[PDB]
Design a protein around this ligand. Sequence first.
Ligand code: NH3
Ligand code: NH3
Ligand code: NH3
Ligand code: NH3
Ligand code: PT
Ligand code: PT
Ligand code: PT
Ligand code: PT
Length: 129
Amino acid sequence: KVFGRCELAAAMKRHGLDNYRGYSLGNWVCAAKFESNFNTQATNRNTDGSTDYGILQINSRWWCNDGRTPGSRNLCNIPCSALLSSDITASVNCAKKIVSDGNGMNAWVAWRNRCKGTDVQAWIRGCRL
Ligand SMILES: [N]
Ligand SMILES: [N]
Ligand SMILES: [N]
Ligand SMILES: [N]
Ligand SMILES: [Pt+2]
Ligand SMILES: [Pt+2]
Ligand SMILES: [Pt+2]
Ligand SMILES: [Pt+2]
């Protein structure tokens, strides 16, 4: 499922991400856009042999089990295939853990390189919260 810009903001605000650890909604919407293009089914194999899964491209090295990442933690206790659901719940609850683990949204390279320090307000422009 490829969400719309305003559609994903709503599901995101609802599952409790707006101001989560002091990151406003636009930051999460911007990260989704540059990670997955809002596609819940997005996967990207990394040179390291891990894979990033879903709307927030959560990585198999640390966070989820895809049964093929050689040496790999499963912090979030889920198979990576539950990050590809059209319901973003599982992606969201894993994202709260990730963002809580010290580095905040720097965990998402696409956030640090493209969203950090820009007007992320514009990403929720014309959406009903
Ligand atoms: N939720
Ligand atoms: N998109
Ligand atoms: N999906
Ligand atoms: N969702
Ligand atoms: Pt789908
Ligand atoms: Pt939902
Ligand atoms: Pt939720
Ligand atoms: Pt777009």
